[PDB]
RNA sequence: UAUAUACAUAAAGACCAGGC
């Protein structure tokens, strides 16, 4: 009777922003992103792309609680590199990876069939 | 008025309020309520 | 259609002051006890809000010049009490304008036509000015949906 | 500070199965791929079921349960259909859903099996999968019993309800002979070797590699029959890149709005 | 009651393999050879057909409400 | 036009079975 709807995990209702950016006062150049209606699929890709960036000192995510679906990503970069720039370059670098993987998987298919 | 199903010979008979319950062509006293007409719609979940 | 106030007790009957200002005799069982609305509000002759317990003056009609305490209110009628009035145990009735202060949807089967629940069939438990409560036939649960989403089926 | 460039080698390709080997990738990118093979590859599967007359020994929502789990041929038009929630029209149209019909009555004395072959679709494209190998069994009927119902199939994906998983078990393995030491065997000699092992029968484990990090991520992706296994993968990549292109958008609108 | 579609763990379809599996047993296969002909490699699926209990044959002995 | 349909009833006790 209290079971939440199945669709409630990936669907946003009125008023919920997808992303919420809040600066972090503990630290200089630290920012904390809040992603609604996402899980470890999306959060883990980005964290692991941020740690390749040598100008990123810290990156990590957590699901605060499993029953509510949101991600919280802290990022701390070096001075004169903004933590919002770090998080955008991460997303464009995956897109430039996954667009290279979808093209290389199509070539191996045609090679595989009758070849 | 109300169509009921005999629990023995399985013949729908029409029997109405303030009548003893006996199905014609058996004599069996247990009647069932058939099934509702209105729309039932389920999730396949 | 008619309400009144009991103003005398007899062994088999009451004397009742009706809402028109006449006193009638009725057997104890010929009248039913009515739930009093202690929170009733009405307008007086100067458009003031008046309430039960208020002291009002009568400025028109038969009791013009009298003063009384509002005991009961019903539609266009006020039953008042004044202890100086020996008639009818102090009770009398005045028009409020002669005074001055001194659902159809529920039960239907609807199909949710928009939003995340789109397609589910249900029956309305409660209807509101805004959001009806649909009782889902598919699962065990009741949900609140804007009434713009619902669509009645047959 | 930039994305690595992976490569793919397809080893086995059949109608039930795909084995590919992805190299030069993160552990986190290679995972999130197989983690999309389950959830987010869209598929067509029955959702709204309407039961007109059910005389079977199985109660209504027990049959409405088995119908959902039946796989439907999603090969193409999944791209064309719109989610029913985004679809503007009232109730169901040809654009957001497919209509199925099952009218079955047992006249004969013999016990009749209602099989998924009795689902009859308004469109030739999507049918039950076995119709494209015995047929899935919905219910059995004694003489006199009748089951007729109408069911609209929708588009959805595996996060909602498990009946939209395009795939059977998706295998994943990396570093089969253990160099990285992500798992530490108390006795290394008692463990069988992976199909992918490069080691002779003599030695148990590869020697420790301090600098290494996991690469060569071995998959096996076995379809349920809805989507041919080659296009379970193309739909996962194209469906992860669409969630990352939904972020860069709605992040850019916030950085521009906040500043 | 009746054999599940969709093996619980992995999600492969064992729904259609039951009536084909009774055929192999009456051909004097052993459940190990039967389940390999049906092509069920993992033991998550091999426990659906092997541990199944078919009551839909018992329940069809009783007569329906309607003739 | 105004005004109105406002909530109460299913007793209690006995034994029996189970839960932590
Ligand atoms: Zn009879
Ligand atoms: Zn299985």
Curated annotation (Swiss-Prot), chain A:
Name by which UniProt lists this protein: DNA-directed RNA polymerase II subunit RPB11
InterPro entries: RBP11 (IPR037685), RBP11-like (IPR036603), RBP11-like_dimer (IPR009025), RNA_pol_Rpb11_13-16kDa_CS (IPR008193), Rpo11-like (IPR022905)
A Pfam family the protein falls into: RNA_pol_L_2
Molecular-function annotations in GO: DNA binding; DNA-directed RNA polymerase activity; protein dimerization activity
Function summary: DNA-dependent RNA polymerase catalyzes the transcription of DNA into RNA using the four ribonucleoside triphosphates as substrates. Component of RNA polymerase II which synthesizes mRNA precursors and many functional non-coding RNAs. Pol II is the central component of the basal RNA polymerase II transcription machinery. It is composed of mobile elements that move relative to each other. POLR2J/RPB11 is part of the core element with the central large cleft.
Keyword Ribosomal protein: no
Cell compartment(s), UniProt: Nucleus
Signal peptide boundaries: none
Gene3D superfamilies noted in UniProt: RNA polymerase, RBP11-like subunit
GO biological process, one term: transcription by RNA polymerase II
Keywords: Acetylation, DNA-directed RNA polymerase, Nucleus, Transcription
Organism the protein comes from: Bos taurus (Bovine)
GO CC entries: nucleus; RNA polymerase II, core complex
PROSITE patterns: RNA_POL_L_13KD (PS01154)
Residues where N-acetylmethionine is found: 1
Family: Belongs to the archaeal Rpo11/eukaryotic RPB11/RPC19 RNA polymerase subunit family.
Swiss-Prot record, chain B:
GO biological process, one term: transcription by RNA polymerase II
Top-level lineage group: Eukaryota
Keyword field: DNA-directed RNA polymerase, Metal-binding, Nucleus, Transcription, Zinc, Zinc-finger
Location within or outside the cell: Nucleus; Nucleus, Nucleolus
Zinc-finger is among the record's keywords: yes
GO cellular component annotations of the record: nucleus; RNA polymerase I complex; RNA polymerase II, core complex; RNA polymerase III complex
Cysteine pairings via disulfide bonds: none
Quaternary structure (record): Component of the RNA polymerase I (Pol I), RNA polymerase II (Pol II) and RNA polymerase III (Pol III) complexes consisting of at least 13, 12 and 17 subunits, respectively. Pol I complex consists of a ten-subunit catalytic core composed of POLR1A/RPA1, POLR1B/RPA2, POLR1C/RPAC1, POLR1D/RPAC2, POLR1H/RPA12, POLR2E/RPABC1, POLR2F/RPABC2, POLR2H/RPABC3, POLR2K/RPABC4 and POLR2L/RPABC5; a mobile stalk subunit POLR1F/RPA43 protruding from the core and additional subunits homologous to general transcription factors POLR1E/RPA49 and POLR1G/RPA34.
Family of the protein in this entry: Belongs to the archaeal Rpo12/eukaryotic RPC10 RNA polymerase subunit family.
Protein name: DNA-directed RNA polymerases I, II, and III subunit RPABC4
UniProtKB/Swiss-Prot annotation, chain C:
Transmembrane domains' residue ranges: none
Domain KOW: 50-83, 104-137
Modified residue annotations for N6-acetyllysine: 118
Location(s), subcellular: Nucleus
Phenotype upon changing residue 35 to E: Reduces the affinity for Pol II elongation complex
UniProt tissue specificity: Ubiquitously expressed.
Post-translational modification: Methylated by PRMT1/HRMT1L2 and PRMT5/SKB1. Methylation negatively regulates interaction with P-TEFb and RNA polymerase II.
Ligand binding (RNA): 35
Binding site for DNA: 75
Parts forming coiled coils: none
Complex formation: Interacts with SUPT4H1 to form DSIF. DSIF interacts with the positive transcription elongation factor b complex (P-TEFb complex), which is composed of CDK9 and cyclin-T (CCNT1 or CCNT2). DSIF interacts with RNA polymerase II (Pol II); forms DNA and RNA clamps that stabilize Pol II elongation complex while maintaining the nontemplate DNA strand in the transcription bubble and nascent RNA in the exit channel. This interaction is reduced by phosphorylation of the C-terminal domain (CTD) of POLR2A by P-TEFb.
Family: Belongs to the SPT5 family.
Protein name: Transcription elongation factor SPT5
Organism taxonomic ancestry: Eukaryota, Metazoa, Chordata, Craniata, Vertebrata
Swiss-Prot record, chain D:
Coiled coil feature spans: none
Keywords assigned by UniProt, alphabetized: DNA-directed RNA polymerase, Nucleus, Phosphoprotein, Transcription
SMART domains the UniProt entry points to: RPOLD
InterPro entries attached to this UniProt entry: DNA-dir_RNA_pol_30-40kDasu_CS (IPR001514), DNA-dir_RNA_pol_insert (IPR011262), DNA-dir_RNA_pol_RpoA/D/Rpb3 (IPR011263), RBP11-like (IPR036603), RNAP_Rpo3/Rpb3/RPAC1 (IPR022842), RNApol_insert_sf (IPR036643), Rpo3/RPB3_RNA_Pol_subunit (IPR050518)
Sequence positions bearing Phosphoserine: 123, 245
SUPFAM superfamilies according to UniProt: Insert subdomain of RNA polymerase alpha subunit, RBP11-like subunits of RNA polymerase
Pfam families: RNA_pol_A_bac (PF01000), RNA_pol_L (PF01193)
Location in or out of the cell: Nucleus
Binding site for Zn(2+): 87, 89, 93, 96
TM regions (residue ranges): none
GO cellular component: cytosol; nucleus; RNA polymerase II, core complex
GO BP of this protein: transcription by RNA polymerase II
PANTHER family, alphabetized: DNA-DIRECTED RNA POLYMERASE, DNA-DIRECTED RNA POLYMERASE II SUBUNIT RPB3
Assembly and interaction partners: Component of the RNA polymerase II (Pol II) core complex consisting of 12 subunits: a ten-subunit catalytic core composed of POLR2A/RPB1, POLR2B/RPB2, POLR2C/RPB3, POLR2I/RPB9, POLR2J/RPB11, POLR2E/RPABC1, POLR2F/RPABC2, POLR2H/RPABC3, POLR2K/RPABC4 and POLR2L/RPABC5 and a mobile stalk composed of two subunits POLR2D/RPB4 and POLR2G/RPB7, protruding from the core and functioning primarily in transcription initiation. Part of Pol II(G) complex, in which Pol II core associates with an additional subunit POLR2M; unlike conventional Pol II, Pol II(G) functions as a transcriptional repressor.
Organism: Bos taurus
Gene that this sequence comes from: POLR2C
């Amino acid at each position: 009777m209290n079971a939440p709807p199945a669709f409630e995990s990936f669907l946003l209702f009125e008023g919920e922003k997808k992303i919420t950016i809040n600066k972090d006062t503990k630290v200089p150049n630290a920012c904390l992103f809040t992603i609604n209606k996402e899980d470890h699929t999306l959060g883990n890709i980005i964290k692991s792309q941020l740690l390749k960036d040598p100008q990123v000192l810290f990156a990590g995510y957590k699901v605060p609680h499993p029953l509510e679906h949101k991600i919280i990503i802290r990022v701390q970069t070096t001075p004169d590199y903004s933590p919002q720039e770090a998080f955008t370059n991460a997303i464009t670098d995956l897109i430039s990876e996954l667009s290279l993987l979808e093209e290389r998987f199509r070539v191996a298919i045609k090679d595989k069939q009758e070849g | 008025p109300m169509i009921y199903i005999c629990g023995e010979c399985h013949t729908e008979n029409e029997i109405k309020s303030r009548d003893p319950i006996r199905c014609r062509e058996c004599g069996y006293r247990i009647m069932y309520k058939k099934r509702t007409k209105r729309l039932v719609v389920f999730d396949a979940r | 259609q008619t309400v009144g106030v009991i103003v005398r007790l007899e062994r088999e009957t009451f004397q009742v002051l009706n809402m028109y200002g006449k006193v009638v005799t009725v057997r104890h069982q010929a009248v039913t006890r009515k739930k009093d609305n202690r929170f009733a509000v009405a307008l007086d002759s100067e458009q003031n809000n008046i309430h039960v317990k208020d002291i009002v003056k009568v400025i028109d009609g038969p009791h013009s010049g009298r003063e009384g305490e509002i005991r009961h209110l019903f539609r266009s009628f006020a039953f008042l009490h004044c202890k100086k009035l020996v008639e009818n145990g102090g009770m009398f009735v005045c028009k409020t304008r002669h005074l001055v202060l001194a659902n159809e949807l529920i039960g239907q089967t609807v199909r949710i036509s928009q939003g995340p629940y789109k397609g589910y069939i249900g029956v309305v438990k409660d209807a509101t000015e805004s959001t009806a409560r649909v009782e889902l036939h598919s699962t065990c649960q009741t949900i609140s949906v804007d009434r713009q989403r619902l669509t009645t089926v047959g | 500070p930039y994305a690595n460039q992976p490569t793919v080698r397809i080893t086995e390709l059949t109608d039930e199965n795909v084995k590919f080997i992805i190299e030069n990738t993160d552990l986190a990118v290679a995972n999130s791929i197989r983690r999309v093979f389950i959830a987010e590859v869209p598929i067509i599967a029955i959702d709204w079921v309407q039961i007109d007359a059910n005389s079977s020994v199985l109660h209504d929502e027990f049959i409405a349960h088995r119908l959902g789990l039946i796989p439907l041929t999603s090969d193409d038009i999944v791209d064309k259909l719109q989610y029913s929630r985004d679809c503007t029209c009232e109730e169901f149209c040809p654009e957001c859903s497919v209509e199925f019909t099952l009218d079955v009555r047992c006249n004969e004395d013999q016990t009749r099996h209602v099989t998924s072959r009795d689902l009859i679709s308004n469109s030739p494209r999507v049918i039950p999968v076995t119709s494209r190998q015995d047929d899935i069994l919905i219910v059995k009927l004694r003489k006199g019993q009748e089951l007729r119902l109408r069911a609209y199939a929708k588009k959805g994906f595996g996060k909602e309800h498990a009946k939209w998983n395009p795939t059977a078990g998706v295998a994943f393995e990396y570093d089969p002979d253990n160099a990285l030491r992500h798992t530490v065997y108390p006795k290394p000699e008692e463990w069988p070797k992976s199909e992918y092992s490069e080691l002779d029968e003599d030695e148990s484990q590869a020697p420790y590699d301090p600098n290494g990090k996991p690469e060569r991520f071995y998959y096996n992706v076995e379809s349920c029959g809805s989507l041919r296994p080659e296009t379970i993968v193309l739909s996962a990549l194209s469906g992860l890149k669409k969630k990352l292109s939904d972020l860069q958008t709605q992040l850019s609108h916030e950085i521009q709005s906040d500043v | 009651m009746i054999i599940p579609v969709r093996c619980f763990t992995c999600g492969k379809i064992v729904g259609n393999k039951w009536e084909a599996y009774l055929g192999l047993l009456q051909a004097e296969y052993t459940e190990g050879d039967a389940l390999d002909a049906l092509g069920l490699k993992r033991y998550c699926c091999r426990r659906m057909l092997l541990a199944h209990v078919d009551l839909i044959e018992k329940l069809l002995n009783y007569a329906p409400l309607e003739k």
